[model samples]
Target: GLSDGEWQQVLNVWGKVEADIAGHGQEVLIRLFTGHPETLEKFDKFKHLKTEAEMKASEDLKKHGTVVLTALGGILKKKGHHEAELKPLAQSHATKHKIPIKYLEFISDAIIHVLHSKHPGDFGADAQGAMTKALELFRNDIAAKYKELGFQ
Candidate 1:
């Protein structure tokens, strides 16, 4: 439901640094763990890695980080029509992982933070607005699914 200009802003910023997807992904995960340490408890494979270096070196972290970034990329590609693509992710997190909607929101924030930090100039207000709208759409959809599944 984004305007053409908003979509353009998003595409412009993202296209500029798409090559750094892995780096951005890693940073997002690191920030998530550092900002909310309890979030790591959900990942049994990562909970024991005490140090940032250890976490960064973790194969599991790398894989999951890439997966998360890839999902985000996929979401971006679909633009306004993301609901269908996102449903399975929402359902899995709600039923299998039991991930709270707050955590999902945190992930969205982390991605935005990364975008801002990595490409400050490219990610201006317009780009931020578009990305926020896109993230909100996903977050709201996921939250609804989580609620429907009786998850808090």
Candidate 2:
């Protein structure tokens, strides 16, 4: 947790570039996950069109993204952060609607797109790092929430 003044400083920096953060985040949760479901589905459907190298890369990206998201959930839950802190606020609606957590893959894919396109220079490196950190935070938080809900 940041001290009061430190929080302000962090906010200020974030505010100046809030668009970057927000745009990327929105892209992740919306465009990639929900927005382009058809495209992703198609990719899965016709993935054989790709050369061996392309297919390998695609598989790698999917594998890596899933690993990151799952890990993030564990990390955050363990740290006592709630799901609300890690994912977009709109996820609450999904929860209320009885959406399965598996559906969050859409959002995870979106996040990867947003990060990749918005910060091309540092997309792979920075995103992987941030996601790693987020996984830790989310994992811890989610575990506690599930326990509270009597999952165990």
What TM-score, over all chains together, does every model reach? 0.91, 0.41
Worst 10 residues of 1 by lDDT: 13-22
Per-residue lDDT tens digits for candidate 2, residues 1-152, read 32344333333323322444433333343354345444344334333433433533454444544544444434333333344554443244234433333444455455555655665665445335545444343434444454455443
Q: Choose the strongest candidate by TM-score.
A: 1
Q: Can you write out model 1's per-residue Cα lDDT over 95-147, one digit (the tens) per residue?
A: 88888999988888988888878877767787789889877877887877887
Going through the candidates in order, what is the number of backbone clashes in each? 0, 29
Instruction: Give the poorly placed runs of model 1, Cα more than 4 Å off.
Output: none
TM-score of 2: 0.41
